[PDB]
Design a protein around this ligand. Sequence first.
Ligand SMILES: NC(=O)C1=CN([C@@H]2O[C@H](COP(=O)(O)OP(=O)(O)OC[C@H]3O[C@@H](n4cnc5c(N)ncnc54)[C@H](OP(=O)(O)O)[C@@H]3O)[C@@H](O)[C@H]2O)C=CC1
Length: 456
Amino acid sequence: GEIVSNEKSGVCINAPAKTKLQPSVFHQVFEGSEPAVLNSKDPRLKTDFEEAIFSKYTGNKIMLMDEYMEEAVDHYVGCLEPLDISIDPIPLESAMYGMDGLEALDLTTSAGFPYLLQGKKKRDIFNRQTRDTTEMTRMLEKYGVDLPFVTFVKDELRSREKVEKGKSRLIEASSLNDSVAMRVAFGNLYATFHNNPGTATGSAVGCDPDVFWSKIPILLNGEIFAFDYTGYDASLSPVWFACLKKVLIKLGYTHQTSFIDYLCHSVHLYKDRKYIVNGGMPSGSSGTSIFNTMINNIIIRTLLIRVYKGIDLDQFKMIAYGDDVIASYPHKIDPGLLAEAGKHYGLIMTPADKGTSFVDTNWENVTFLKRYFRADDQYPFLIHPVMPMKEIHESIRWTKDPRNTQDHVRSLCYLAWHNGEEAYNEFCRKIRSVPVGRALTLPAYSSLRRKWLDSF
Ligand SMILES: NC(=O)C1=CN([C@@H]2O[C@H](COP(=O)(O)OP(=O)(O)OC[C@H]3O[C@@H](n4cnc5c(N)ncnc54)[C@H](OP(=O)(O)O)[C@@H]3O)[C@@H](O)[C@H]2O)C=CC1
């Protein structure tokens, strides 16, 4: 992603609010390092604010698809075909309200241009209960599609370096109109993927880690390697979008590449500004996560081929959620080498195995979706999704709405127990060393562990 232009938008797009992050009744009970920089004049910046949040954009590797890419596409198109992905579009009411494999469109995310400036809240239009499918149809009529991407900073916690640096995350929110039409072209694609995490889709988008993480080592089973990217969604040159376009063709798609063109060449509204981006995937589009994940299936296949000349991908399996990869192949590979030839397409990647001094990525030290893996003692064949306590600790020190504390820790509890009884005792002990949590309902270890085995 690279910014080709920026000019006066024509809109006085609303400056954001203050943050909603306040220290929690556990801010002093657990140890941690605070909410994201949301304006220039925040007292905590050590470099130019506006400069750090668009530096995600690093430039394109402008080019035509090379011979490796074209083969990676065919292998992935052929991994997908058993999943029979209807090119047909879903009815409008299915896009809006949902269907099997597709939740209802989410009511809280913004509607973006040009609604957010005209007093049309999506609460008004949508009206779940009646499944009313008439408002949008005249909304899409009034404004069409291919509409700008309203840009909000993410309201979230970040590490200290990222607050000091100003490395805050942006939401590039597409329009409701855009959302719906997309949801109508690829709904049964979304649906297909959502109902089928694993090696075929090569995806875990919409997986339950509590019950899907045990499937994970059976499908990979070979010699695993994993990767994390740096500024991934922005490190995408237009070409990868074309490889996605090429995949989608072999799935039998036609005029619906329009949508990926909607993502490649992107037009975003910041404040009183209109910047245009060529290459780089927007975070707010109705399939951002799905399309990121397919491109990552293309990227990886390409890197092996380009690197290991004689190669058979039939016995090659991978699983991506956005930028998070984890992959298998019978025989050993140098992920450091894929990371290398990956720079030749302008992509900064980092494998788990960092070098010969470094212990091989194994099932004990590898991660995915921020979680490590660990087999149960009793039923080893069952894999815990283990989230670091550090991660939970940092999660608990701050609150959005202190009235939503009970569910906000219960939600944390269902994640924390996979670290073991003793650690869960430590955790609940710490919680009940402070007035507020002493009355708090907590799930006991045995209850959580029972509920988990019944997920199967
Ligand atoms: N049926 C059940 O009872 C269960 C349901 N679930 C839930 O369903 C989810 C599966 O779908 P998910 O995993 O969310 O994959 P997503 O639907 O999040 O992938 C959609 C992508 O498109 C963008 N987007 C556009 N419009 C919307 C919208 N209206 N709502 C949300 N994202 C939107 C998002 O970007 P951005 O993030 O910028 O919006 C996201 O990256 C699980 O994560 C889990 O929460 C899982 C287990 C059981």
